[PDB]
Design a protein around this ligand. Structure first.
Ligand code: FES
Ligand code: FES
Lengths: 63, 63
């Protein structure tokens, strides 16, 4: 049971790097692998959780 | 097909918040929902990807 059906399926391993000096006030990062704005959250987690009963959600990095 | 079988299954929605002033040099955050050090990566993604063919990996936040 894989988790990612959408993001860079050609890649062997998806690791994203961000510098704190690009966060601004705050940024929300996707942990559900469904965002169309990867690696940022775009709210797609909500439909996923409703359909599946899951409870996943983003990481908020703040300043 | 839910993604999270491990983290706070009582919770309706798992949103984590971190302040950049707690990153230090860098921190790696789990996006595979298998870490025993949630919300940080503990390398559990590697066994998951080997078993399933998946390609998920952490978010690295650096300074
Ligand atoms: S779109 Fe994936 S966690 Fe929000
Ligand atoms: S342990 Fe989950 S992304 Fe590394």
């Amino acid at each position: 049971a894989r988790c990612n059906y959408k993001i860079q399926l050609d890649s062997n391993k998806i690791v994203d790097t961000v510098d704190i000096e690009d966060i601004g006030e705050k940024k929300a990062f996707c942990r559900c692998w469904k965002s169309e704005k990867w690696p940022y959250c775009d709210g797609s987690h909500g439909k996923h959780n409703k359909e599946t009963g899951d409870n996943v959600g983003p990481l908020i990095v703040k300043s």
